[PDB]
Design a binder for this molecule. Structure first.
Ligand SMILES: CCCCCCCCCCCCCCCCCC(=O)OC[C@H](COP(=O)([O-])OCC(O)COP(=O)([O-])OC[C@@H](COC(=O)CCCCCCCCCCCCCCCCC)OC(=O)CCCCCCCCCCCCCCCCC)OC(=O)CCCCCCCCCCCCCCCCC
Ligand SMILES: CCCCCCCCCCCCCCCCCC(=O)OC[C@H](COP(=O)([O-])OCC(O)COP(=O)([O-])OC[C@@H](COC(=O)CCCCCCCCCCCCCCCCC)OC(=O)CCCCCCCCCCCCCCCCC)OC(=O)CCCCCCCCCCCCCCCCC
Ligand SMILES: CCCCCCCCCCCCCCCCCC(=O)OC[C@H](COP(=O)(O)OCCN)OC(=O)CCCCCCCCCCCCCCCCC
Ligand SMILES: CCCCCCCCCCCCCCCCCC(=O)OC[C@H](COP(=O)(O)OCCN)OC(=O)CCCCCCCCCCCCCCCCC
Ligand SMILES: CCCCCCCCCCCCCCCCCC(=O)OC[C@H](COP(=O)(O)OCCN)OC(=O)CCCCCCCCCCCCCCCCC
Ligand SMILES: CCCCCCCCCCCCCCCCCC(=O)OC[C@H](COP(=O)(O)OCCN)OC(=O)CCCCCCCCCCCCCCCCC
Ligand SMILES: Nc1ncnc2c1ncn2[C@@H]1O[C@H](COP(=O)(O)OP(=O)(O)O)[C@@H](O)[C@H]1O
Lengths: 344, 96, 42, 64, 63, 318, 459, 54, 52, 120
């Protein structure tokens, strides 16, 4: 990429979420969403492999129709209130549209089909951006409008996502898609507490970002899109085997690690609000997510899969190092739990 | 008034369209646009009968962003009938 | 003797585009490692 | 080694749930477990009634 | 050091824990009240700002 | 080397000159290509890379002393010959390690070409490795899947690297090579069934040569033209480097290729793909031991610059 | 209680920083002394529970265990010096640290005032244990065993998480001290009848009940000796400690909501005891012995009579020490024999004279010989169970007869009979093997002299 | 009762139940039309969920 | 909104035109201008829950 | 939640009102934890990059232990404020709306009949 183009695109992919967050005029929030859609598509097809064009053409159609639905909500509001922004008075259907639409861009629940497929055809790098710096934008729009959205729908999309994400993940063996599925699940918890305590959504996101960003830079350190590929981690780079183990169990909710806090406080907030029906079912299938996380643990760490002689060759050569971010984001993530009170 | 319900249903009829592909990517990219026209018409209509001139900028910003949006959409389309010789969606089933 | 490290067969299962292969799903084959399909002369 | 494998690790791979196996696989797990419940409930209930009505002596019983 | 230290230490531990418990419950009641009543600093949702309402004299008269 | 450097100068465009090309010379097991190579190199100052070896990677990395056989993948060309169609498959393991070695050599060559600007003569290349496997499958040496595994590795890694500019070639009929073998006597090299040598050349003649003819400049030389480096060198300086994929390599395109070869761990990333054919598999218990032992060699237990055994210092501030 | 804990943490730095050759002695020698500091908690001249500080407390029920948890780390590190002496010098220092963290975590869990501190630390102990079982497990099936050990505990655990957050909202603090001195009386609704099950079920799972105990036979089979010692001696008892402190609340329901478990346990005690009678794997038989002798405990922590509780406290500490002793000697036979089969290796006393004395005393502890805390324990649970319903003696009477039979069968077909002709010749006994045993039984003899210390909260 | 009946009921059954779910939930054509209509169905149901609970 | 970089920076690129009663070009008041004022000077200092 | 409070500083980290609160003692266990959390990050880095774990980057080790800690004091300083605002807000409401939070008076046990469920 002519480095100039790289700058323009990257600026847009970054001006995209930032305009959304900063503005209050919904319109300006919509174009922030629009710029993110335009900026991400070029990077998605960088290899320009036949799989890639498929990825982008899906991502784009799914993103575009949702963008149009979000605009329709703003256009309708403009007639029901002269304001260009959702208010207490807003017709309920107007808000529900925004939930569905925004739940498509974020890819939650019954609209979770595009994400796993686009996460499969894009590079590991652009995978991260597509999973974590593109969720900030839509979530911002929701978090702003939380007082007004429906508790019922969110919960249904929340629970569905948790289930779909979990069930989908169990079968998958491609890593990119295992992560895509996890993201659907975590995204679910996040949207469950939005109606009740938005501030916790912003924790269940950061922690997801501080967990997923190290996890993916791990997958690419050896650029392994297969579990079999990550399983030979012990030969290619032995040290990351320890933290890859804890980060994945952290992604699932197991108690000593940082990953428990988001689930724990979301459950505490939902019980405070009396959803002890919903919270219980979510926590239970949340346990399904750890099963596929630990199955990967087995292959990568607890058991040593057989490797190839040609690997000895890759050992010889100095391994290009993992950026510092890996460490700082691996530790702050695997073990901050002793510092939970301040985090919340 | 009713004028608005026709435009809104136009957008839903265009909605039903984009969500039900018929083997032609181009046609879809063309339906998608049918919405933008319906949104542009509705935004312009209410702005005009609310005498809200401060908002007319929007009816056009909507079109400017929608045009590029479509530009990107068509370049993907051209990219597809360069890799598969057709815009037919069925071809787009490798990511299974 | 020595803790059983996984043999080739234990490894085999984790290959294939789906862990728990279905009736028709199994018919599929793992994605190309290069991420570029052999496709066709076109 | 063929004997132990046959006896603790070749069992469930050769399990097919028939009758004479599930009828007999429920009489064994729940049969006595339900028998003793009506043995212990009836005793515990007899005891409680008697204690309530004032007949059980519970003499020199200062422990439990 | 003695029986005195643990008895007095345990009473201090109970007072902190009793007082923490009463406050945690009162929070939940205050937070129930301000959400529905909207009469307290928490849960004060925003409405447009009057700092943009244009109170100027419009050429168009009668408004 | 990165975008930062490239952004500020450091362009392969400014470092290329007529003598700067990737020239490989390929022949049969004994085509005298070793000699022609050195000379062509001496002619244009081209860095002459030696044919890839079992321990070429070890000479490449760290100390450069030859590694123990098991550390270098346990491959014997010697055993290749004395025990063809071996139960353990040393011949396929030999071939797979050889492909990895030339992948490292070709990538090191491209890194020298784009950085220095000097050209490179690489003798046999990843592009001319398949002839050995084709002959081996034509013989009982390798089975069909073994072939597929090599082809899969070749398809995954070879396309990324740019093609040889020209591919100087020698030819000396099988009788010639066998006789040439007798002159340098080595029990192992000596016992190479002719038909196998027949299959090696046949592939170049039929597959490799025309293949590259369309892609790169093809200069085939009869033994007599050979042993006359001057004449061959002259002809290279004569051919016009036009036809080929190299024409589109703009500076902003070279940068990415450079950053690849600059990273050896990636060059052969797909060489270790988890395809479990039995010959290739290390095996966890044996592989773990070989690793604990290769990683404990002096200067290898820590990254270059940080292992004190070989005399590295300043580790406490690095 | 931060001397039983901080000095413990520092063990981790010592296992890592220390020389590869001297790593074993620094760690084992120091934790022996760590146990000596642990003994200070036993100084309770008065009744008042010793509330060290806000989060850390030790009452009669926890104190007898914290000392056992600190005591076994030395022993665990002495029983695993053989296997795990074939490792790369960084696999060892990981195993040693894993064992160290278990008692750090277990010491805190047994010494925790806030019930959810119990939960977080409670369910954390699975991480160290699963690594010990899966990473170093000899058999092909430990991946499976690990899954069983993680899911059975985890599915039970999330209900307890919901329940404890639930009581915190209902009462306003999960502090065991207050919860005790506050009025939490459930109201026998249908819902409460569920709360009770939510709180007890997670504890009932790791304390193998007849219905959910399949995890323990599978886990101890492939687990390394140190993991099997930890699971039997401290890990299973985590479930019992939890049931004692959690049933302070849910006071009214267990009167009638316990029948299901009580009957499950007493019938379970008979069947688990009996299948020990014909099980070819010795580690298998000890594990089911552990299920049955722990089925007695869930039937005393539910009858809830003063004697039951301290019968329970007596038996849990006693059976913990005895089981390990049995699992430790089983390993010594396994390492020389190289097979878990009970039928092979017959006649050992002829070739290992003393280990057989340790085998005999361990079996007599296993069955109820009378001048032992093991018998006092069962005698007491037996008494209360009889009080609950005189008929209970029949079922707790078939278990005693069966328990005698399998305990002696382990001695009769492993340590008597004609010697096996020529298995790989059995090298003589190391002094470590014998001490690891002596260290288990010498405390069993000393505790039996003064049973008062391990009697529980009730008495 | 040990081994088969107490392993087929609690530990194994739960193993089987979910695997079926993933298989049925994860056996997807990969075609966009199918997936998208499912989006259609969703919009319809949510439209109703609001409608009936108006 | 989510990140108020506008109030902080003092800039008002997005607030000046969110309602009909805002400044209209050439001071040509828009329709309904008689009420929105009355309905937003009312709901100013009173949060939504009590602006409803 | 706490946003929308009167006087809210729209983008500020810790309003000066937080001056009134005591400063976090530099050795507060938490800041000390952050320190250890940091040292470990450093050590971990060395490990992943294959350097002598403890004897390398002794400059970095310092940057880490000293970056994390620096961050702590200024974060904790805030989180401490946020919690302190919460009381100011909470306690105030309890009073301004007194009737809703009425000081009840329990009866002594002598009067309260608590049910006795006999264990027997
Ligand atoms: C619920 C919690 C459960 C925790 C346990 C379970 C969860 C964690 C599991 C981790 C392992 C999972 C399985 C991973 C795969 C294992 C097999 C494998 O492939 O490993 C190969 C892998 C090969 O790596 P290597 O090249 O041999 O690396 C050498 C090591 O770094 C060793 O280097 P060395 O020994 O040569 O260097 C010595 C150095 C070694 O340094 C390290 O390795 C540090 C690692 C930190 C990991 C943290 C994980 C959490 O010693 C030190 O640690 C520093 C000592 C001096 C500074 C002291 C600072 C003050 C400490 C005060 C006390 C701290 C504790 C109490 C808190 C303070 C008081 C309140 O083996 C490992 O190194 C494992 C590294 C991680 C060990 C973590 C142990 C944590 C124990 C708790
Ligand atoms: C490091 C070795 C010592 C370095 C000393 C440096 C110089 C110094 O400041 O010492 C004097 C200084 C004097 O403190 P002080 O003001 O007398 O404090 C007395 C308080 O009663 C004691 O203060 P406190 O206990 O009230 O501290 C507040 C807070 C402080 O927070 C913590 O430090 C939690 C540490 C958990 C480990 O405590 C808690 O957070 C309570 C919950 C603790 C459990 C949280 C979860 C535990 C398991 C988490 C596992 C995470 C890794 C998983 C890996 C897989 O000692 C310290 O504050 C630091 C002691 C070491 C703290 C941990 C450092 C790691
Ligand atoms: C209430 C208790 C059970 C009461 C019924 C017991 C007898 C059931 C007879 C079923 C006959 C059909 C059958 O085979 O079982 C049903 C099912 C397996 O069915 P299938 O594999 O389709 O076999 C077809 C045979 N014509 O397999 C089953 O579902 C068996 C259902 C009963 C299993 C009871 C097991 C209890 C185990 C308790 C252990 C406690 C310790
Ligand atoms: C070998 C030797 C082993 C010796 C073991 C001895 C164990 C004795 C256990 C006795 C437990 C009960 C003691 C009091 C029994 C009694 O006579 O009076 C109370 C009994 C209560 O019976 P209930 O069900 O409440 O209904 C009757 C109401 N009038 O009222 C009755 O009388 C009802 C009839 C009770 C008959 C109890 C017979 C128990 C026999 C136990 C040993 C033989 C069975 C061994 C196990 C067989 C099954 C495996
Ligand atoms: C397997 C291990 C054991 C699992 C036990 C699960 C038991 C059911 C979940 C926990 C039940 C429970 O916590 O009971 C009390 C709870 C609240 O009941 P209640 O007092 O009415 O609360 C309303 C206050 N205004 O009532 C409930 O939470 C009832 C929830 C029932 C459905 C929960 C989802 C179950 C999924 C399986
Ligand atoms: C009352 C007591 C309740 C106890 C519940 C125990 C649940 C776990 C029992 C054992 C489940 C199991 O072993 O799962 C195996 C199954 C297939 O796994 P597999 O394809 O073999 O890969 C694993 C590595 N070999 O893996 C699966 O397909 C999923 C099986 C269930 C995994 C845990 C589900 C928890 C659900 C919580 C709601
Ligand atoms: N794929 C291969 N399999 C086996 N041997 C190979 C392969 N590629 C190269 N060689 C070895 O390389 C050697 C080249 O012969 P040599 O006389 O050393 O150099 P030159 O080929 O220049 O004459 C041969 O002896 C042959 O064994």
């Amino acid at each position: 990429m002519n480095p100039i183009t790289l700058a323009i695109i990257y600026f847009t992919i970054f001006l995209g979420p930032v305009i959304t967050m900063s503005s209050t005029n919904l319109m300006l929030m919509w174009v922030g969403l629009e710029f993110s859609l335009l900026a991400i598509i070029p990077m998605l097809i960088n290899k320009k492999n036949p799989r890639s064009t498929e990825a982008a053409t899906k991502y784009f159609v799914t993103q575009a129709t949702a963008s149009m639905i979000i605009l329709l909500a703003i256009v309708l509001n403009y007639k029901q209130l002269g304001t260009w922004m959702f208010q207490q008075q807003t017709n309920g259907l107007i808000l529900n549209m925004t939930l569905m639409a925004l739940s498509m861009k974020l890819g939650l629940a019954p609209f979770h089909f595009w994400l796993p497929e686009v996460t499969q055809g894009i590079p590991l790098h652009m995978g991260l951006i597509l999973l974590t710096w593109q969720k900030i934008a839509p979530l911002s729009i929701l978090i702003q409008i939380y007082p007004l959205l429906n508790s019922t729908i969110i919960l249904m999309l929340a629970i569905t996502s948790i289930f779909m994400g979990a069930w989908g993940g169990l079968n998958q063996t491609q890593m990119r898609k295992i992560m895509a599925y996890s993201s659907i699940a975590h995204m679910g918890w996040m949207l469950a507490i939005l109606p009740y305590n938005p501030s916790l959504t912003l924790l269940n996101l950061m922690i997801y970002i501080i967990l997923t960003a190290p996890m993916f830079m791990a997958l690419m350190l050896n650029n392994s899109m297969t579990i079999n590929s990550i399983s030979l981690l012990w030969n290619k780079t032995p040290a990351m085997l320890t933290m890859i183990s804890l980060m994945l169990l952290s992604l699932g909710g197991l108690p000593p690690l940082t990953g428990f806090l988001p689930k724990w406080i979301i459950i505490t907030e939902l019980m405070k609000n009396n959803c002890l029906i919903m919270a219980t079912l979510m926590a239970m299938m949340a346990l399904l997510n750890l099963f596929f996380y630990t199955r990967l643990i087995y292959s990568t760490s607890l058991t040593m899969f057989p490797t190839n002689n040609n690997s000895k060759m890759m050992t010889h050569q100095t391994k290009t190092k993992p950026n510092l971010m890996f460490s700082t984001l691996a530790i702050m993530s695997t073990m901050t739990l002793p510092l939970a009170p301040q985090l919340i | 008034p009713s004028t608005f319900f026709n435009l809104t249903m136009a957008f839903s009829l265009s909605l039903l369209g984009t969500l039900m592909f018929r083997s032609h990517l181009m046609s879809t990219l063309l339906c998608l646009e049918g919405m933008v026209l319906s949104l542009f018409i509705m935004t312009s209509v209410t702005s005009l009968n609310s005498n809200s001139m401060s908002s007319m900028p929007i009816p056009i910003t909507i079109l400017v962003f929608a045009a590029c949006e479509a530009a990107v959409g068509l370049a993907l389309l051209v990219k597809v009938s360069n890799t598969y010789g057709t815009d037919y969606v069925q071809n787009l089933n490798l990511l299974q | 003797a020595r803790q059983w490290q996984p043999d080739i067969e234990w490894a085999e299962q984790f290959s294939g585009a789906v862990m728990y292969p279905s009736k028709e799903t199994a018919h599929w084959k793992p994605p190309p490692w290069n991420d570029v399909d052999i496709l066709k002369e076109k | 080694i063929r004997w132990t494998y046959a006896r603790s690790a070749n069992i469930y791979p050769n399990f097919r749930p028939t009758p004479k196996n599930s009828l007999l696989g429920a009489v064994a797990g729940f049969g006595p477990l339900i028998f003793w419940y009506y043995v212990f409930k009836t005793d515990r209930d007899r005891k409680e009634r008697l204690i309530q009505e004032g007949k059980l002596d519970r003499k020199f019983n200062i422990s439990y | 050091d003695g029986p005195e230290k643990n008895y007095e230490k345990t009473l201090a531990i109970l007072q902190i824990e009793s007082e923490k418990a009463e406050l945690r419950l009162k929070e939940q009641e205050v937070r129930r009240l301000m959400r529905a009543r909207g009469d307290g600093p928490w849960y004060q949702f925003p409405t447009p700002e009057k700092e943009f309402i244009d109170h100027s004299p419009k050429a168009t008269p009668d408004n | 080397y990165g975008l930062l450097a490239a952004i500020l100068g450091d362009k392969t465009t400014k470092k290329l000159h007529e003598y700067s090309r990737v020239i490989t010379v390929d022949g049969n097991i004994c085509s005298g290509k070793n000699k022609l190579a050195k000379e062509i190199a001496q002619q244009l100052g081209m860095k002459h890379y030696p044919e890839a070896g079992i321990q070429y990677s070890s000479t490449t990395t760290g100390d450069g002393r030859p590694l123990d056989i098991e550390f270098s993948g346990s491959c014997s060309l010697e055993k290749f010959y004395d025990d063809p169609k071996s139960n353990d498959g040393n011949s396929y393991r030999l071939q797979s390690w050889l492909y990895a070695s030339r992948l490292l050599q070709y990538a090191d060559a491209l890194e020298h070409l784009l950085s220095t600007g000097q050209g490179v003569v690489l003798e046999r290349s990843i592009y001319s490795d398949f002839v050995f496997l084709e002959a081996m499958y034509n013989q009982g040496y390798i089975r069909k899947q073994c072939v597929d595994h090599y082809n899969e590795i070749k398809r995954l890694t070879l396309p990324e690297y740019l093609p040889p500019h020209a591919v100087i070639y020698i030819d000396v009929p099988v009788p010639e090579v066998q006789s040439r073998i007798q002159k340098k006597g080595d029990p192992h090299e000596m016992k190479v069934t002719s038909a196998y040598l027949q299959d090696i050349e046949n592939a170049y003649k039929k597959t490799f040569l025309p293949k590259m003819s369309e892609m790169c400049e093809v200069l085939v030389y009869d033994s007599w033209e050979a042993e006359d480096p001057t004449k061959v060198v002259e002809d290279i300086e004569y051919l016009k480097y036009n036809k080929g994929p190299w024409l589109k390599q703009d500076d902003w395109t070279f940068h990415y290729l450079r950053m690849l070869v600059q990273d050896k761990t990636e060059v052969l990333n797909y060489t270790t793909i988890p395809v479990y054919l039995p010959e290739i598999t290390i095996g966890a218990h044996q592989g773990s031991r070989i690793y604990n032992s290769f990683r404990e060699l002096p200067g290898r237990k820590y990254a270059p610059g940080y292992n004190a055994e070989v005399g590295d210092k300043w580790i406490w501030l690095k | 209680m931060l001397k039983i804990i901080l000095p413990s943490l520092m063990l981790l730095p010592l296992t890592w920083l220390s020389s590869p050759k001297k790593t074993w002695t620094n760690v084992t020698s120091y934790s022996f002394l760590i146990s000596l500091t642990s003994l200070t908690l036993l100084w309770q001249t008065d009744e008042n529970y010793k509330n060290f500080s806000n989060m850390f407390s030790s009452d009669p029920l926890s104190t007898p265990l914290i000392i056992l948890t600190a005591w076994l780390l030395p022993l665990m590190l002495m029983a695993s010096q053989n296997h795990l002496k074939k490792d790369n010098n960084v696999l060892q220092k990981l195993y040693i640290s894993m064992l160290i963290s278990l008692q750090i975590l277990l010491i805190m869990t047994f010494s925790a005032t806030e019930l959810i501190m119990f939960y977080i630390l409670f369910e954390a102990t699975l991480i160290p244990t699963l690594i010990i079982i899966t990473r170093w497990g000899n058999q092909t099936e430990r991946l499976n065993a690990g899954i069983y050990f993680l899911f059975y505990t985890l599915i039970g655990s999330i209900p307890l998480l919901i329940a404890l957050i639930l009581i915190q909202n209902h009462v306003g603090t999960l502090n065991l001290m207050i919860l005790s001195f506050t009025t939490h009386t459930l109201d026998a609704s249908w819902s409460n009848n569920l709360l009770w099950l939510a709180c007890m079920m997670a504890f009932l799972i790791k304390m193998p009940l007849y219905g959910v105990h399949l995890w323990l036979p599978k886990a101890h089979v492939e687990a390394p000796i140190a993991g099997s010692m930890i699971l039997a001696a401290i890990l299973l008892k985590l479930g019992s400690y939890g049931m004692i402190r959690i049933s302070i609340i849910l006071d009214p329901l267990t009167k009638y909501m316990a029948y299901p478990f009580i009957l499950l346990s007493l019938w379970g005690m008979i069947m688990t005891s009996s299948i020990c009678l014909r099980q070819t794997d010795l580690k298998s038989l000890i594990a089911y012995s552990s299920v049955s002798h722990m089925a007695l405990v869930i039937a005393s922590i539910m009858i809830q009579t003063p004697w039951s509780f301290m019968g329970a406290t007596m038996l849990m500490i006693a059976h913990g020490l005895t089981s390990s002793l049995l699992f430790c000697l089983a390993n010594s036979n396994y390492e020389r024999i190289h097979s878990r089969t009970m039928i092979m290796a017959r006649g050992l006393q002829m070739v290992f004279p003393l280990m057989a004395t340790w085998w005999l005393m361990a079996s007599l502890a296993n069955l109820a010989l009378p001048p032992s805390i093991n018998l006092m324990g069962e005698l007491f649970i037996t008494m209360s169970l009889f009080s609950w319903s005189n008929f209970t003696i029949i079922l707790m009477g078939i278990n005693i007869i069966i328990t005698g039979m399998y305990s002696m069968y382990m001695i009769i077909t492993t340590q008597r009979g004609k010697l096996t002709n020529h298995m790989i010749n059995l090298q003589p006994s190391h002094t470590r093997e014998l001490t690891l045993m002596a260290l288990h039984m010498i405390p069993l003899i000393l505790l039996t002299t003064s049973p008062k210390l391990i009697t529980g909260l009730t008495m | 009762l040990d081994l088969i009946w107490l392993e087929k009921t609690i530990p194994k059954s739960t193993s089987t139940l979910h695997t079926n779910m993933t298989t049925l939930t994860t056996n997807q054509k990969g075609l966009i039309k199918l997936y998208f209509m499912s989006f259609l169905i969703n919009i319809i149901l949510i439209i109703i969920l609001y409608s009936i609970n108006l | 909104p989510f990140l108020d970089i506008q109030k902080k920076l003092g800039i008002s690129l997005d607030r000046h035109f969110m309602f009909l009663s805002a400044e209209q070009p050439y001071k040509n008041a828009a329709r309904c201008h008689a009420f929105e004022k009355e309905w937003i000077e009312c709901a100013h200092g009173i949060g939504g829950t009590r602006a409803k | 939640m706490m946003n929308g409070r009167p006087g809210h500083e729209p983008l500020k980290f810790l309003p000066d009102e937080a001056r009134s609160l005591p400063p976090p003692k530099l050795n507060d266990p938490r800041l000390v934890y952050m320190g250890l959390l940091g040292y470990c990050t450093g050590l971990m880095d060395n490990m992943l990059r294959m350097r002598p774990v403890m004897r390398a980057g002794l400059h970095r080790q310092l940057l880490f232990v000293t970056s994390f800690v620096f961050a702590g004091y200024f974060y904790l300083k805030r989180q401490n404020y946020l919690y302190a605002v919460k009381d100011h807000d909470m306690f105030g409401y309890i009073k301004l709306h007194p009737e809703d939070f009425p000081e009840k008076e329990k009866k002594t046990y002598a009067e309260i009949l608590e049910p006795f469920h006999p264990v027997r």
